Design a binder for this molecule. Structure first.
Ligand SMILES: COC(=O)N[C@@H](C)C(=O)N[C@@H](Cc1ccccc1)[C@@H](O)C[C@H](Cc1ccccc1)NC(=O)O[C@H]1CO[C@H]2OCC[C@H]21
Lengths: 99, 99
């Protein structure tokens, strides 16, 4: 679809079989979700943003469905204030900015 | 134009008579620029991202040219690691996400 930016670009995602709301964020390199129980191995990692760094769990090769488009890639899980879909998965679903 | 998301979506902006590089960021409500001395009145504000909050100076009705498209709105100035163009100005240049 085509999404304007008058409101936050929130979409429903499906991950680990659960539905969540997440923000489509072109300013994020990486995808970061709030604390949740995901199956599989994970590695400790740190990620930095506007206010500093947080500790996250890095899950590799995770299936995530974003408005019906499938992606398989890295998901970081940790104490982010908002669920963020970053460029690592926006590219897989063919997302571009247009103006 | 059309901007893909393989790399950070950095563009040249013109503000306060100066040229800068900034990130087009659908995940930001507001526009936040690195420390710069802008003339006029301002209001204190705090803005939050991953990792916490930073203190910024809020300037109103600032003109910014983004790849030749003009926008006028609120600009926050403070110790951000990167210049961020947020939805308050992306809507004015007619920017959409498409997939
Ligand atoms: C209403 O609150 C706001 O609008 N807040 C605005 C200011 C804000 O912070 N928005 C972020 C999403 C967001 C986070 C928390 C709450 C609401 C929204 C992103 O849109 C922009 C940042 C920009 C940035 C790039 C490089 C280095 C530092 C900062 N990107 C980011 O934090 O990305 C992380 C994940 O991926 C990695 O890549 C870059 C850094 C890492």
């Amino acid at each position: 679809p085509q999404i304007t930016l008058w409101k936050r670009p929130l979409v429903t995602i499906k991950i680990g079989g659960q539905l969540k709301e997440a923000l489509l964020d072109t300013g994020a390199d990486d995808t970061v979700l709030e604390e949740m129980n995901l199956p599989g191995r994970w590695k400790p990692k740190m990620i930095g943003g506007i206010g500093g760094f947080i500790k996250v769990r890095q899950y590799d090769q995770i299936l995530i469905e974003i408005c019906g488009h499938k992606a398989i890639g890295t998901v970081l899980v940790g104490p982010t204030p908002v669920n963020i879909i970053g460029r690592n998965l926006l590219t897989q679903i063919g997302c571009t900015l247009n103006f």
